[PDB]
């Protein structure tokens, strides 16, 4: 729109306009430094974001999903436009945040926190190993023997259009094991620390999702700080019910931070 175009423009006229470190801003060059090491995990400052334009604190929680998407789109359209040399290897991006003036302990988050901006910590426990999932929907026709084609995918929902090279026909189908896009996976099970309990009873816990960029960093019993966001499996079997819906809650990680972080770590001041 007129205004709904200006989101990406604000990012563009942010990353090379809001400048500190005595000139020659990070996000002028920090993105270059991300492309250099082949990471694709650029991270953003909420502090600096508010120091530029406060506006995108309220325009986030109504759908932080679309905020993050409309950001990383800008990272591509900048990178491959100025670094078309990049356009072989990965050519896909998403960004992170590390400034949220809040720690929500566990046993603190409830129905108001639904599907919006979050922070919390805890302790790791046993979880899964290393697996991928899918990323794109494509099958194979057999009435005409064609491909159904690739189809636009919703987060956990079916598509099934009639349009396809088989005279837009062939309701039935089969599926291949290739020509389709993949995505690593790993899980976590988060517990709360033995210091900040309610002083003597059993503790609480909920589970957390990490994604293909995010695996083989955690371990059982490790130190941590994560933004994450509040999930909802939208149906853990609604019907003629219990005395209670069998619902659950997860957090999906955007930016995980280790609070030990025993590697060579810090950025550089300019001088």
């Amino acid at each position: 729109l007129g205004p709904r175009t200006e989101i990406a423009n604000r990012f563009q006229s942010f990353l090379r306009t809001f400048v500190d470190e005595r000139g020659a801003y990070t996000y002028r060059d920090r993105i270059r430094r991300m492309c250099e090491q082949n990471m694709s995990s650029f991270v953003v400052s909420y502090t600096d974001l508010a120091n530029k334009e406060h506006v995108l604190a309220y325009f986030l929680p109504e759908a932080p999903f679309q905020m993050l998407e409309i950001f990383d789109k800008v990272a591509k359209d900048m990178v491959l436009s100025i670094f078309p040399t990049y356009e072989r290897v990965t050519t896909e991006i998403h960004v992170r945040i590390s400034e949220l003036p809040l720690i929500e302990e566990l046993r603190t988050f409830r129905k108001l926190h639904l599907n919006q901006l979050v922070r919390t910590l805890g302790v790791v426990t046993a979880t899964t190993g290393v697996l991928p999932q899918l990323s794109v929907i494509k099958y194979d026709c057999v009435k005409c023997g064609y491909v159904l084609g690739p189809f636009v995918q919703s987060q956990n929902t079916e598509i099934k259009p009639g349009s396809c090279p088989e005279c837009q026909s062939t309701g039935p189908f089969s599926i291949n094991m290739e020509q389709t896009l993949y995505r690593n996976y790993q899980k976590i099970t988060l517990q709360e620390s033995p210091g900040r309990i309610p002083a003597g009873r059993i503790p609480r816990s909920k589970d957390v999702i990490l994604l293909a960029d995010l695996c083989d960093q955690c371990k059982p019993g490790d130190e941590l700080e994560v933004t994450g966001i509040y999930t909802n499996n939208y149906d853990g079997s609604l019907n003629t019910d219990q005395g209670f819906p069998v619902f659950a809650t997860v957090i999906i990680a955007n930016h995980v931070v280790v609070k030990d972080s025993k590697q060579v770590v810090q950025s550089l001041t300019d001088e």
């Binding site: 309990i197 002083a199 609480r204 019910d241 005395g243 819906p245 659950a248 809650t249």
Partner: protein, 628 residues
């Protein structure tokens, strides 16, 4: 429709309390007024006030409640509308009270439903928060999906026929988790009343549920007062119910589910009594409605200034909590400093700095060193006592498990360990095994402790001081061996404990008859105790206030605590020839907070050299008291 009488009833109840409700004042508008900004939707209502103004809707209420209940929410919305420019976001939680009748787990029938009755019990095997998106939006697939209807029933059914069109009536739209109606509860269990403990049958247990505002304020070891909302429970499947089964076989002209329902129970009110303390901004029995730092934190300054000003109140207060007791007058003044604050500095990231101090009792047998402390559990908050052998080393630790219940290894708490900013003293420090002993060897000083063999990154912490209960070898202080052989114990804890104050026994007849003369006013059932100077209420309020002050040292005795301590180790330069003893900077640390607390008595900051001198006197007392 049935309950329109209830509609008009609570309507004109509002319309009356829309005017005054109580003496030109209303008790349920300012709670609602605080509600108006965040709009949290909980307001308890007095059940007495139905009988005051509505003239016994109680019996209009206390049977058909479950059906009437929802209309009270509409009534609530109608209340909030009248003076607030209002949207229908408003809701209705209730936490009912002012109800007389108190029944228990036995008077249960089909006839007990839709009431508000108040009930207690115990709390066991608690269970967690588990949300609920009860509502959403759902109809046919094409366009006609805007559905904020009544679809939130417990028995949930996506299938709806249609609203506008002739369209799918089993093919649904997709879901709404975005702009719809959700809420929360939890689930726990309850055992039979310990006030109603008959023979024979088991502790029949009830199921229990909690709404929003009730949540995470139930807890083990607590009795309650519920609503009486016994249920028809929208259950799904069960066995052994082989009674007759029915279902509507419709009209003949030219889906199935087995039916066996079970019971549970629901409630929307709590007064978790016997578990309520309140700090200092609570107005007590004795108050003085005045201005202060906070509401009632010291608004009795009108007296507490006086209780902080006398040079006599030291001894008077030393005598204002031992009316029924008589012994030495050194622990009667020192032991309070254990309960009294310490240092409380505002300082660096060097390491945790401590406020509390170790404290001891030793004495010969039958001296009522127990009765000093038997009351202390009844006295202080956070600071509940038992013995150490009163449990296992699942006192310090939890009960060590080696069977699978949730993840097969659980040691995450204890009994010493949950005494955060209260003391949980113990008796019998001499014959207890050397396990918790070496645990305490650092758990008192380095209040940051760990374990292995089952550790979820084990990092626990002690918080308070201690009270000891030694007794000699022979039962008597027969001066026939050194103290290190009189008790047969270790050094560092005899230095970790910076304060001893042993209570020695003798035989002089006047003493014992003077004790019986205490007894003269122990069973004179009118005047079975001695006079006092200061009531308990003001006492504990002054105690609760005297911390919030930032004690300080800038004093030349602060500069020349070097002098008194140099003399401390000058006179203690010996204590090495005849049965050597050891000096150590824990003594200095202890004297420091001791002097500081001794000035915290003053309701004042800023240490004075009087406090150093008395502290030096008292340390001299303790160390020469250690002399054989």
């Amino acid at each position: 429709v049935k309950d329109e009488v209830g509609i008009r009833a609570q309507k004109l109840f509002q319309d009356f309390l829309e005017e005054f409700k109580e003496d030109g004042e209303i008790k349920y508008t300012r709670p609602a007024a605080s509600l108006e900004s965040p709009d949290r939707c909980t307001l308890e209502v007095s059940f007495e006030d139905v009988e005051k103004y509505d003239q016994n809707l109680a019996t209009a209420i206390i049977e058909e409640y479950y059906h009437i209940y929802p209309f009270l929410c509409q009534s609530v919305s109608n209340y909030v509308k009248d003076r607030i420019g209002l949207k229908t976001q408003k809701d209705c939680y209730v936490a009912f009270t002012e109800v007389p009748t108190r029944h228990k787990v036995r008077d249960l029938t089909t006839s007990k439903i839709g009431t508000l009755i108040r009930i207690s019990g115990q709390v066991v095997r608690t269970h967690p928060v588990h949300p609920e998106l009860v509502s959403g939006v759902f109809m046919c697939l094409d366009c006609q999906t805007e559905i904020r209807n009544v679809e939130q029933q417990f028995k949930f059914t996506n299938p709806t026929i249609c609203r506008n069109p002739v369209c799918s009536n089993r093919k649904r739209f997709m879901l709404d988790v975005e702009k719809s109606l959700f809420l929360d509860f939890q689930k726990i269990r309850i055992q039979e009343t310990q006030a109603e403990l008959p023979r024979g049958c088991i502790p029949r247990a009830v199921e229990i549920i909690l709404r929003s505002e009730l949540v995470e304020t139930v807890q083990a070891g607590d009795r309650y007062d519920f609503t009486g909302t016994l249920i028809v429970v929208p259950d799904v499947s069960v066995l052994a119910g082989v009674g007759t089964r029915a279902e509507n076989s419709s009209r003949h002209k030219p889906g199935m589910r087995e039916l066996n329902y079970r019971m549970a129970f629901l409630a929307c009110s709590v007064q978790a009594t016997t578990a309520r303390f309140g700090g200092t901004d609570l107005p007590m029995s004795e108050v003085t409605a005045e201005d202060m730092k906070k509401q009632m934190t010291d608004a009795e300054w009108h007296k507490i200034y006086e209780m902080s000003k006398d040079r006599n109140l030291y001894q008077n207060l030393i005598s204002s909590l031992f009316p029924s007791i008589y012994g030495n007058d050194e622990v009667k003044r020192g032991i309070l400093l254990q309960q009294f604050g310490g240092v409380a500095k505002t300082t660096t990231e060097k390491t945790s700095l401590r406020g509390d101090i170790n404290v001891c009792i030793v004495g010969d047998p039958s001296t009522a060193k127990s009765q000093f402390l038997k009351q202390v559990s009844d006295f202080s908050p956070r600071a509940i006592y038992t013995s150490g052998k009163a449990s296992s080393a699942a006192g310090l630790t939890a009960a060590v498990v080696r069977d699978e219940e949730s993840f097969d290894f659980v040691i995450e708490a204890g009994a010493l360990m949950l005494a955060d900013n209260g003391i949980c003293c113990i008796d019998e420090f001499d014959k207890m095994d050397q396990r918790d002993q070496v645990a305490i060897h650092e758990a008192m000083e380095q209040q940051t402790i760990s374990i292995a063999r089952a550790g979820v990154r084990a990092t626990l912490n002690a918080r308070t001081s201690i009270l000891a209960a030694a007794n000699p070898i022979n039962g008597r202080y027969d001066r026939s061996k050194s103290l290190q052989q009189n008790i047969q114990l270790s050094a560092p804890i005899m230095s970790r404990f910076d304060l001893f104050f042993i209570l020695v026994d003798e035989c002089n007849e006047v003493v014992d008859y003077a004790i019986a003369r205490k007894i003269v006013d122990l069973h004179s059932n009118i005047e079975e105790s001695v006079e006092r100077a200061y009531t308990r209420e003001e006492v504990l309020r002054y105690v609760t206030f005297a911390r919030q002050f930032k004690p300080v040292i800038s004093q030349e005795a602060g500069h020349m605590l070097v002098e008194n301590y140099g003399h401390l180790r000058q006179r203690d330069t010996g204590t090495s020839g005849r049965s050597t003893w050891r000096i150590t900077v824990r003594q200095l640390e202890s004297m420091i907070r001791l002097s500081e607390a001794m000035a915290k008595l003053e309701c004042s900051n800023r240490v004075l050299e009087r406090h150093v001198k008395e502290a030096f006197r008292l340390l001299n007392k303790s160390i020469i008291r250690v002399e054989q």
